[PDB]
Design a protein around this ligand. Structure first.
Ligand SMILES: CCCCCCCCCCCCCCCCCC(=O)OC[C@H](COP(=O)([O-])OCC(O)COP(=O)([O-])OC[C@@H](COC(=O)CCCCCCCCCCCCCCCCC)OC(=O)CCCCCCCCCCCCCCCCC)OC(=O)CCCCCCCCCCCCCCCCC
Ligand SMILES: CCCCCCCCCCCCCCCCCC(=O)OC[C@H](COP(=O)(O)OC[C@H](N)C(=O)O)OC(=O)CCCCCCCCCCCCCCCCC
Ligand SMILES: CCCCCCCCCCCCCCCCCC(=O)OC[C@H](COP(=O)(O)OCCN)OC(=O)CCCCCCCCCCCCCCCCC
Ligand SMILES: CCCCCCCCCCCCCCCCCC(=O)OC[C@H](COP(=O)(O)OCCN)OC(=O)CCCCCCCCCCCCCCCCC
Ligand SMILES: CCCCCCCCCCCCCCCCCC(=O)OC[C@H](COP(=O)(O)OCCN)OC(=O)CCCCCCCCCCCCCCCCC
Ligand SMILES: CCCCCCCCCCCCCCCCCC(=O)OC[C@H](COP(=O)(O)O)OC(=O)CCCCCCCCCCCCCCCCC
Ligand SMILES: CCCCCCCCCCCCCCCCCC(=O)OC[C@H](COP(=O)(O)O)OC(=O)CCCCCCCCCCCCCCCCC
Ligand SMILES: CCCCCCCCCCCCCCCCCC(=O)OC[C@H](COP(=O)(O)O)OC(=O)CCCCCCCCCCCCCCCCC
Ligand SMILES: CCCCCCCCCCCCCCCCCC(=O)OC[C@H](COP(=O)(O)O)OC(=O)CCCCCCCCCCCCCCCCC
Ligand SMILES: CCCCCCCCCCCCCCCCCC(=O)OC[C@H](COP(=O)(O)O)OC(=O)CCCCCCCCCCCCCCCCC
Ligand SMILES: CCCCCCCCCCCCCCCCCC(=O)OC[C@H](COP(=O)(O)O)OC(=O)CCCCCCCCCCCCCCCCC
Ligand SMILES: [Ca+2]
Lengths: 615, 503
């Protein structure tokens, strides 16, 4: 039954991708879509019926060499069960949503066939991520890690006739390989220190790792801190954290349904999953955890500032994903991993709705993506307007200030900000400031596209009409999670320590549980005792951003123009995204090409062959 | 059946002799007969070699199917296989039928083209079965003759220079090894490889000219064998023959050049260098680690700067063999098994990639990357095959490419972390040039007049790739099929190496 969830999407993708000419594109679309809904149904049954006893389901031996053995296997615990419903539910809805969104695509002439290929990629992308989350060993985790990398490369560059898509897909693959550089080095170090890659066997030896010095390069390091850092480098790339983020905003070149799947369920969340799955190690690696907090906090602040000035609708949401993952890494860094997954679970709901809602806006507006030509539209697409409004309420953290009554992101974000206050003063202030920016650019998105006067060309505005039911029903389903997910799961994830202990079935060896928290780790308890001003600070930051956005686009709509003139250098800085792409071209891309040419003509040509030909 | 290795070795050569004698005519019908006879012979050799594979017993680390006969000049004709060489025999016999099938559209001197490949097959097989020191050298250097003519006759515009560089540069390396082999013959009193695997060659330092020879006679013998195998592998900086020979050769010649002939360098290290010169191997380990690390970074960057599609694939091979050399000299269970798996894996992937170059070369008669673009628009099947083997080339998990790279890197990490870090950068650099080549050739829009009428892969071209796709996936998902065969033999080899190290 666990195996069907894992392998049914793979079999459907192979049939749809390779054999649609035999059965037809329409049948191939239903085959993939129907299989995900069956897998999603089984995923929910596994999640709701889980009894807290982790299960191991062998499949096949993968790599066996001397004392090294890694197997194809399924591990089912609380941590996996959470990821099962997230991956299959969002993937299933994207399949259903895609049936209408890709019904007629202008990127392809009538001669070209694309529908069956698109649905085959979605099913395989799902299979890759299901392999990542069910992994019982680090090696199978790497397979799913690289599987989503190649599956994303196929989908970002789906429109292969566009150079921008091909560049973005290539960039995403290469930047993620830089992350897998560190992740591979972590696997090598873990195996030789512990003699295993299996999670349970690793976690048994973690206490001894914290007292072990391992030589790496020019010096000796604490084994736990070094291996924690190396594995996090892999997570930075997959979650598009600072210095490894530039690929995510360029991934918008793919079809909109791909973005909802990449940004909400599969790729970005994998990095957070790895840290939470490896919490037994990080709880014994204090210095690795500190680095995770700084990167998480800085990414949360960085991506929030950049999104303030973006004019493309999908790029505003893309940078919001980078910012939101910054929050999750702060929670994990301070040692509260349930809060990190609580936000991951709620984020999957309302983020997937923001992209699918944005796609509906793009779908209605003749595939225009620039918010400067989206005036009006509140009345022309009512169901898309309310789907996006609920998503904004969730992401901005709308709720009753001092209670536990509010939208999904109200409860999961306030859990992290309280944890940050008890964990890091640096992180706490960067998170509340970033929360203020989150409200501004979220409400800037709503006001620029749904309010004001119809702006831009009038041909698309007059023809704007609501998307078909096949596209709106998935939005409705997600809205159910974007409203009740936070209140439903607040208790099991963050509410009560005893309740959290049994839910995750958590110095003794840190084994047997979905997550581990060290006995000396009390940040979760201190978070509940945070002062009132700390608990309400997210709300005040939210209102401050909302009022600023309202004063900038509804009232006195000339303020955004005047301010940018007053501060032109800073405006260019944010608009150009802090110039990371330009910097990397200067330091990495161009020097690498120059070095290769010099080695080719200087080394092989003039020095080596020059000598051989000389003699 | 009792002479099973001798049959697979000399059946391809015997068939070539019969073909030369009794196959008359030069018209198309004569050429058609030659192609079929070569295909049936190569297929027969593959089927016979499957009997060796399926009756092979991995637990027995000694040599199996051994046959011994008297020979000339006091030497013995001895053949046999163990867990280290059995899979290279099957690789050689597996690629030959596919290579012949790919040459089905050639019309220039077909009978001689079939004869050259049939003769080459027999000589390539003997390298992996010989258990006599001189006999191994005979097959090792005899293969240079047919390949010298394959490049010269059916090669590109610079084939005359490439053929001479390939022969003389390889011949120069091997003659030094010949003198070392004679010395081992004189010291041990035998050319029997099984006997030499247990002989203790002196390892005490002595002064030769103005330098101390750290490792004694073992180091002198090691260097002679290293010079031969380093050039064959090839290692950096003795690799510059390869971008000439592999590029100027015909498509089929390039398949065998990269898929099989390169493996004779890595197999030599596992058969002679470590088993027979363990002290010298331990001393040379630091230098071999850095030569291999440089090769990965150096040739990966050089591949990124190529304007010629076949030169990207050619330079990719040197980078991949860099992993093999590291794994072999890491001299632990994980490194050595990874090295063998990498060598076998590179055979399928590199062979497929050269066949991918051939598919579009046969249509446009140009290897320039800038001459193509948007082939996916007219060539759907080719774009899918070319992407699959592009992914295998960058070591994507699930393909056989990942397993070999992962194991060699982990074995080296145990010894030297600096080398492991530099070598591990290959994952970043391989993706850079491999994906850039695929994009520039296959993706984009079709805007050139010369490509408006290009055709997709024909049924025969597709069927050549299907066996290569299957093997890459099967070993990527179930590598135990290989590590079970090589496992016990590598463990015995690693144990001997450790026992021989100085105390
Ligand atoms: C990356 C560079 C690697 C590096 O810095 O190596 C550190 C080197 C690692 O050597 P080790 O094993 O720790 O000790 C070597 C002793 O010599 C112990 O030496 P030994 O007794 O084992 O015997 C000598 C051993 C010493 O070998 C070594 O490990 C040291 C020298 C290795 C070569 C250095 C890199 C070569 C080029 C790299 C380019 C890659 C792209 O072998 C060699 O001498 C090998 C020589 C290399 C031959 C290759 C040259 C081909 C032509 C070019 O350690 C240091 O020298 C200390 C750390 C210095 C780091 C500086 C790097 C810059 C900042 C980054
Ligand atoms: C390290 C560096 C980190 C710096 C982080 C500080 C962030 C403060 C930003 C200061 C203003 C930047 C600035 O001048 O941008 C300008 C924007 C205005 O919005 P717009 O719709 O893009 O206007 C475009 C206009 N039509 C134009 O072309 O110019 O301005 C804005 O979007 C204003 C948003 C201010 C934030 C409000 C919340 C806090 C209260
Ligand atoms: C062992 C002893 C076996 C007996 C000797 C075999 C001699 C082959 C033979 O019958 O003669 C060559 C044959 C006849 O040619 P002929 O009738 O003169 O002209 C019409 C047909 N070409 O015509 C041929 O078949 C000529 C074919 C020439 C070979 C092809 C060229 C490429 C190189 C082939 C592989 C390398 C062969 C050299 C290996 C030995 C090196 C010392
Ligand atoms: C890439 C690196 C390549 C570097 C060259 C490789 C080394 C080549 C050495 C060949 C083998 C020579 C050898 O083993 O020595 C021969 C002989 C040992 O035999 P011996 O002890 O005389 O036994 C008598 C039998 N009753 O004599 C000895 O004891 C040693 C005599 C050494 C002969 C000179 C070697 C010079 C190396 C070649 C220079 C480069 C060209
Ligand atoms: C192990 C994992 C390996 C992953 C790397 C290989 C993936 C191959 C994907 C093929 C993409 C090639 C580029 C492209 O656009 O392909 C076009 C081709 C034909 O597309 P089609 O829908 O048939 O329509 C005809 C075109 N108008 O499109 C296709 O042929 C699509 C094939 C569907 C495959 C679905 C993904 C499942 C993974 C397949 C792994 C094995 C592939 C072996 C064959 C290649
Ligand atoms: C972990 C802590 C932080 C680490 C700091 C490093 C951060 C990562 C640096 C990433 C640099 C960007 C890589 C991608 C470059 C774009 C490639 C592409 O597809 O563009 C199309 C681009 C041009 O196509 P166009 O944009 O369509 O014109 O293609 C190329 O330029 C071909 C490939 C060039 C070679 C890339 C080599 C990358 C080397 C990175 C080494 C990192 C070492 C640091 C450790
Ligand atoms: C290139 C720049 C390398 C700078 C690394 C400095 C790390 C430091 O000072 O903190 C060590 C710091 C304190 O010492 P410890 O006792 O080893 O923890 O440890 C770490 O946090 C190690 C984390 C791994 C750092 C990457 C090293 C490889 C590059
Ligand atoms: C053209 C190649 C023709 C076949 C090459 C020789 C196959 C050897 C099979 C054994 C022959 C036999 O039974 O005669 C016994 C005879 C003498 O040894 P006996 O087994 O002690 O009678 O063996 C030979 O004639 C050995 C010939 C080896 C030639 C290798 C040269 C090329 C490499
Ligand atoms: C294989 C399928 C059946 C099986 O389990 O085999 C028995 C057997 C496994 O042991 P058994 O099941 O105990 O008989 O397979 C082998 O021993 C060989 C497995 C194939 C290894 C191929 C290595 C790649 C290089 C050689 C060229 C490709 C040859 C393709 C054939
Ligand atoms: C450095 C160590 C030595 C490396 C040697 C690598 C192998 C040689 C690579 C280049 C070969 C050039 C082939 C030219 C082909 C050609 O055009 O021929 C027709 C042609 C003859 O005239 P045609 O037939 O009228 O065109 O060649 C020439 O015109 C050029 C003649 C070049 C002569 C080269 C002979 C010496 C090289 C082989 C021996 C090397 C011994 C090294 C000793 C020191 C060891 C440490
Ligand atoms: C059905 C699969 C047949 C066996 C797969 C291997 C042969 C490749 C497929 C050839 C199909 C065909 O009609 O021949 C075209 C092909 C002719 O070349 P084309 O004109 O490029 O298609 O004929 C052959 O492949 C002849 C050799 C077939 C040997 C099969 C054993
Ligand atoms: Ca020995």
């Amino acid at each position: 039954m666990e195996k069907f969830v894992l392998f049914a999407p793979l079999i459907a993708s192979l049939i749809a991708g390779l054999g649609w000419r035999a059965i037809g594109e329409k049948a191939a679309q239903y085959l993939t879509t129907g299989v995900l809904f069956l897998s999603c149904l089984i995923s929910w049954y596994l999640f709701l019926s889980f009894d807290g006893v982790p299960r191991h389901i062998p499949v096949l031996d993968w790599v066996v060499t001397g004392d090294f053995h890694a197997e194809w296997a399924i591990r089912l615990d609380r941590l996996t069960a959470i990821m099962l419903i997230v991956v299959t539910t969002v993937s299933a809805l994207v399949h259903m949503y895609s049936l209408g969104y890709m019904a007629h695509d202008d990127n392809w002439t009538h001669d070209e066939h694309y529908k069956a290929r698109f649905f085959a990629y979605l099913s395989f992308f799902t299979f890759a991520m299901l392999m990542l989350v069910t992994a019982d060993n680090l090696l199978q985790m790497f397979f799913g890690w690289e599987g989503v990398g190649v599956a994303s490369y196929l989908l970002i560059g789906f429109y292969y006739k566009k150079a921008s898509a091909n560049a973005a897909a290539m960039k995403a693959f290469i930047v993620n390989r830089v992350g897998d550089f560190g992740f591979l080095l972590g696997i090598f170090g873990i195996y030789w220190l512990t003699g295993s890659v299996q999670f349970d066997e690793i976690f048994r030896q973690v206490p001894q790792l914290a007292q072990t010095e391992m030589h790496f390069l020019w010096r000796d390091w604490n084994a736990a801190n070094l291996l924690g850092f190396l594995l996090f480098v892999g997570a930075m790339g997959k979650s598009a954290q600072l210095l490894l983020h530039t690929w995510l905003p360029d991934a918008m070149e793919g079809p909109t349904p791909v973005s909802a799947l990449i940004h909400a369920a599969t790729m970005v969340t994998a990095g957070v999953f790895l840290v939470c799955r490896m919490s037994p190690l990080y709880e014994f690696a204090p210095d690795a955890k500190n680095f995770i907090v700084i990167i998480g906090a800085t990414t949360a602040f960085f991506a929030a500032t950049v999104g303030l000035v973006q004019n493309d609708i999908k790029r505003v949401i893309a940078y919001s994903t980078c910012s939101q993952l910054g929050y999750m890494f702060v929670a994990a860094g301070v040692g509260v991993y349930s809060a990190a997954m609580f936000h991951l679970l709620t984020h999957a709901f309302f983020k997937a709705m923001l992209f699918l809602g944005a796609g509906s806006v793009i779908h209605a507006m003749h595939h225009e993506q620039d918010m400067r030509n989206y005036g009006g539209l509140r009345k022309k697409i009512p169901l898309t307007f309310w789907a996006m409004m609920i998503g904004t309420f969730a992401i901005t953290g709308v709720g009753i200030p001092l209670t536990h009554l509010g939208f999904a992101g109200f409860l999961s974000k306030d859990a992290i900000i309280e944890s940050a206050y008890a964990g890091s003063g640096y992180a706490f202030w960067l998170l509340v400031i970033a929360a203020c920016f989150t409200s501004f650019y979220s409400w800037r998105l709503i006001f620029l596209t749904f309010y004001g006067k119809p702006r831009g060309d009038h041909h698309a505005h007059d023809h704007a009409h609501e998307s078909p039911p096949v596209m709106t029903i998935p939005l409705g389903v997600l809205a159910i999670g974007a409203v009740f997910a936070g209140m439903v799961w607040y208790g099991p994830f963050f509410g009560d320590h005893h309740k959290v202990t049994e839910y995750f079935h958590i110095i003794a060896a840190p084994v047997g549980g979905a997550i581990y928290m060290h006995p000396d780790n009390h940040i979760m308890d201190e978070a509940h005792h945070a002062p009132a001003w700390v608990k309400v600070s997210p709300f005040v930051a939210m209102v401050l951003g909302l009022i600023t956005a309202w004063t900038f686009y509804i009232a006195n709509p000339s303020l955004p123009r005047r301010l940018a003139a007053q501060q032109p250098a800073l405006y260019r800085f944010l608009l150009n995204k802090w110039y990371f792409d330009e910097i990397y071209e200067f330091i990495f891309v161009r020097p690498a090409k120059w070095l290769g040419r010099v080695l080719w003509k200087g080394g092989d040509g003039a020095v080596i062959d020059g000598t051989i030909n000389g003699v | 059946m009792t002479n099973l290795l001798s049959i697979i070795t000399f059946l391809p050569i015997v068939a070539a002799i019969i073909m030369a004698l009794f196959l008359r005519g030069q018209d198309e019908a004569a050429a058609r007969n030659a192609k079929w006879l070569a295909l049936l012979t190569t297929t027969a050799t593959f089927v016979i070699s499957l009997f060796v594979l399926f009756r092979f017993d991995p637990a027995n680390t000694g040599f199996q199917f051994v046959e011994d006969h008297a020979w000339i000049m006091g030497l013995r004709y001895k053949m046999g296989v163990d867990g280290i060489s059995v899979l290279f025999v099957l690789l050689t016999t597996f690629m030959m039928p596919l290579t012949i099938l790919s040459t089905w559209q050639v019309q220039d001197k077909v009978k001689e083209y079939m004869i050259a490949f049939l003769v080459l097959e027999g000589l390539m097989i003997g390298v992996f079965t010989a258990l006599d020191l001189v006999l191994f050298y005979l097959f090792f250097e005899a293969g240079l003759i047919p390949m010298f003519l394959i490049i010269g006759i059916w090669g590109g515009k610079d084939r005359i220079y490439a053929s001479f560089k390939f022969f003389l540069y390889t011949f120069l390396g091997s003659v030094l090894m010949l003198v070392a082999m004679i010395a081992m013959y004189r010291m041990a009193g035998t050319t029997d490889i099984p006997t030499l695997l247990t002989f203790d060659f002196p390892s005490e330092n002595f002064r030769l000219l103005g330098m101390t020879v750290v490792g004694g006679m073992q180091m002198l013998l090691f260097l002679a064998f290293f010079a031969s195998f380093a050039v064959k592998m090839p290692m950096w900086p003795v690799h510059t023959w390869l971008p000439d020979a592999h590029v100027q050769a015909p498509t089929a010649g390039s398949v065998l050049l990269a898929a099989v002939l390169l493996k004779m360098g890595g197999y030599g290290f596992l058969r002679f260098s470590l088993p027979m010169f363990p002290v010298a191997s331990g001393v040379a380990q630091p230098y071999v680690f850095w030569l291999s690390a440089i090769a990965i970074v150096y040739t990966s960057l050089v591949a990124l700067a190529q304007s010629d599609m076949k030169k990207v694939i050619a330079y990719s091979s040197v980078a991949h063999m860099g992993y093999v050399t590291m794994g072999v000299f890491a001299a632990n269970q994980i490194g050595v098994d990874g090295a063998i798996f990498q060598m076998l894996s590179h055979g399928f992937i590199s062979g497929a990639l050269f066949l991918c170059v051939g598919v579009i070369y046969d249509r446009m008669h140009t290897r320039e990357i800038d001459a193509y673009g948007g082939l996916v628009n007219r060539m759907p099947a080719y774009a899918a095959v070319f992407m699959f083997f592009t992914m295998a080339n960058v070591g994507l998990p699930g393909t056989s490419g990942f397993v070999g790279e992962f194991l060699t890197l982990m074995g080296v990490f145990r010894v030297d972390t600096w080398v492991a870090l530099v070598a591990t950068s290959g994952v970043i650099l391989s993706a850079a040039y491999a994906l850039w080549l695929y994009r520039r050739v296959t993706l984009g829009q079709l805007i050139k007049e010369s490509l408006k009428s290009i055709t997709d892969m024909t049924p025969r071209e597709r069927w050549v790739f299907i066996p290569l796709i299957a093997m890459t996936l099967i070993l990527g998902v179930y590598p135990r099929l290989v590590t079970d065969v090589t496992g016990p033999a590598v463990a015995a080899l690693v144990q001997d190496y450790n026992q021989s190290q100085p105390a």
